Ligand binder design. Structure first.
Ligand SMILES: OC[C@H]1O[C@H](O[C@H]2[C@H](O)[C@@H](O)[C@@H](O[C@H]3[C@H](O)[C@@H](O)[C@@H](O)O[C@@H]3CO)O[C@@H]2CO)[C@H](O)[C@@H](O)[C@@H]1O
Length: 378
C-alpha cells in the first residue's frame, strides 16, 4: 500500500481516486488518497518525511516549494526513473521549475496562473480596459450580487499588480542569470503603488469588502452571484460541475502601472518521498499520472494546463487551453529557491495590513515587509 497526499477536490480529486483504483488493478498495489489542505502540506511533508510520518507521494506540489523541500532532503530525485523521450516532450519552463541542484526533483504535470474568469451570464465579452472593467464591476455590484471579488489578502493572487507597477519577479537576477535573494523587487516604490491600488480596490472603487478570502469569492462565483473573479484553473473543475459558462481573459492593467498586468506561472508536479518504504511502486504510480492521456483527462475534468508539448497541442482548440495560452506569456514563473518560503508570510502580512484600514502607512508597511524578509533570509 502506498499513500498519496493531495490538495485536490471535486472533479480533480475524482480523477486522482480513479487513477488510484486503476493502479491497484494494473499493479496489485493499494493506493490510499489522503486529502490535506494546500496550505498545510509543505510543513507536514518536510517535518514528517524524515520521521517516517509523510505520504509516499504528493500529487501535486507547486514548484515554488522545490528548493526548500530539496534542502530538507525530503524529495526523491526522479531523473534516473524517466526516459529522454518523456523529458523531451516537457515544456522547458516546467523542467526548470522542478530542477534544483542540477537535478530533476519531481515530475512536472500542469501549468497554471490566475486570470480574469468571467461568468457569461453577467459578462458576454471581456472588458477591454481598466475603465470598462471598473464601470462594469461597480454596475453589477448591488444588494446580493457582486461585480468583482478575489482573495485580496493573498500575495500570490496580487503579484500581477506588483508586476504591473514594476516588479519583474520577486527577486532581481544576478550577475548572469541566477536570482539574488538579497535584492527584492516587490518593495520600495513598486510595493507602495501596488499596495495603494489594492487598498483602492476596497476603499475607493468599493469592489472588495472586508472578509473576502478565497472561499468567499470562489463560493460566490460557483453560486452564480459573481460576475468576475481573479482565480486560476484549479477552480474550473467546480465551475464546470456547477455548469457556469465562463470565459478566461487577462486581468486589466491597474491605473498608474507602467507595465502590463502579468501573473505568476506555477507548475504543479508529482514528488516522491525520499523516505518512502515503497519507492518502486510510488514512482511507477507517479509515472501513470503524467502520461499524455492522463494529463488531458485531468484538464478535461478540471482545467490546469498540461506541461506536455504533445498533450497541449492536442488541446490547442479547447477553450480553457486557448484562454490560458493568451495569459501565460504575460507572466513570470515563481522562483523555486529555498528563500521563496520566507517571502510569502511578510508579503501577505503587508497586504492584509494595507487593506485593514484607509489610514494605513503604505510607505512604512512596505519598509517593514522588506525588513522582515531580509531578517528571515539572512
Ligand atoms: O499565498 C501564498 C502561496 O502562493 C502560492 O500558492 C498558490 C498555488 O500555487 C495555486 O495553485 C493556488 O492553490 C490552490 C490549489 O491549486 C487548489 O488545488 C486548492 O488547494 O486551493 C489553492 C488556493 O487556496 O493558489 C495558491 C495561493 O493561495 C505558492 O505556491 C505557495 O507556496 C504560497 O504559500
Amino acid at each position: 500500500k502506498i499513500t498519496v497526499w493531495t490538495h485536490f477536490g471535486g472533479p480533480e480529486l475524482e480523477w486522482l481516486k480513479e487513477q488510484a483504483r486503476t493502479f491497484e488493478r494494473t499493479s496489485g498495489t493499494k493506493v490510499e488518497v489522503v486529502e490535506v489542505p494546500f496550505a498545510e502540506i509543505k510543513q507536514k511533508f518536510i517535518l514528517g518525511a524524515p520521521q517516517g510520518q509523510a505520504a509516499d507521494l504528493v500529487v501535486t506540489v507547486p514548484h515554488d516549494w522545490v528548493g526548500e523541500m530539496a534542502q530538507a532532503g525530503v524529495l526523491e530525485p526522479v531523473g534516473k526513473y524517466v526516459t529522454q523521450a518523456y523529458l523531451a516532450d516537457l515544456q522547458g519552463v516546467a523542467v526548470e521549475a522542478f530542477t534544483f541542484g542540477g537535478r530533476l526533483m519531481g515530475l512536472p504535470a500542469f501549468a497554471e496562473s490566475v486570470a480574469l474568469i468571467y461568468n457569461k451570464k453577467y459578462v458576454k465579452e471581456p472588458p477591454r480596459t481598466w475603465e470598462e472593467f471598473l464601470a462594469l464591476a461597480q454596475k453589477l455590484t448591488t444588494g446580493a450580487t457582486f461585480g468583482f471579488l478575489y482573495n485580496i489578502g493573498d500575495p500570490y493572487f496580487n503579484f500581477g499588480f506588483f508586476k504591473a507597477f514594476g516588479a519583474e519577479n520577486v527577486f532581481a537576477k544576478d550577475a548572469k542569470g541566477n536570482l539574488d535573494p538579497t535584492k527584492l523587487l516587490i518593495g520600495g516604490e513598486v510595493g507602495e503603488k501596488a499596495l495603494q491600488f489594492i487598498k483602492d480596490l476596497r476603499f475607493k472603487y468599493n469592489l472588495v469588502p472586508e472578509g473576502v478570502d478565497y472561499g468567499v469569492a470562489d463560493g460566490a462565483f460557483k453560486d452564480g452571484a459573481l460576475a468576475m473573479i481573479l482565480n486560476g484553473p484549479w477552480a474550473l473543475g467546480d465551475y464546470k460541475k456547477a455548469k457556469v459558462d465562463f470565459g478566461i481573459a487577462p486581468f486589466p492593467v491597474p491605473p498608474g502601472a507602467k507595465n502590463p498586468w502579468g501573473p505568476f506561472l506555477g507548475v504543479q508536479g508529482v514528488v516522491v518521498n525520499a523516505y518512502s518504504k515503497n519507492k518502486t511502486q510510488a514512482v511507477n504510480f507517479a509515472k501513470t499520472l503524467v502520461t499524455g492521456r492522463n494529463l488531458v483527462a485531468f484538464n478535461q475534468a478540471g482545467g490546469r494546463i498540461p506541461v506536455s508539448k504533445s498533450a497541449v497541442k492536442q488541446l490547442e482548440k479547447d477553450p480553457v487551453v486557448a484562454g490560458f495560452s493568451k495569459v501565460f506569456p504575460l507572466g513570470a514563473p515563481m522562483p523555486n529557491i529555498p528563500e521563496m518560503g520566507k517571502v510569502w508570510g511578510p508579503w501577505g502580512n503587508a497586504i492584509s495590513l494595507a487593506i485593514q484600514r484607509p489610514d494605513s502607512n503604505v510607505k512604512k508597511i512596505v519598509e517593514d515587509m522588506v525588513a522582515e524578509i531580509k531578517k528571515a533570509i539572512g
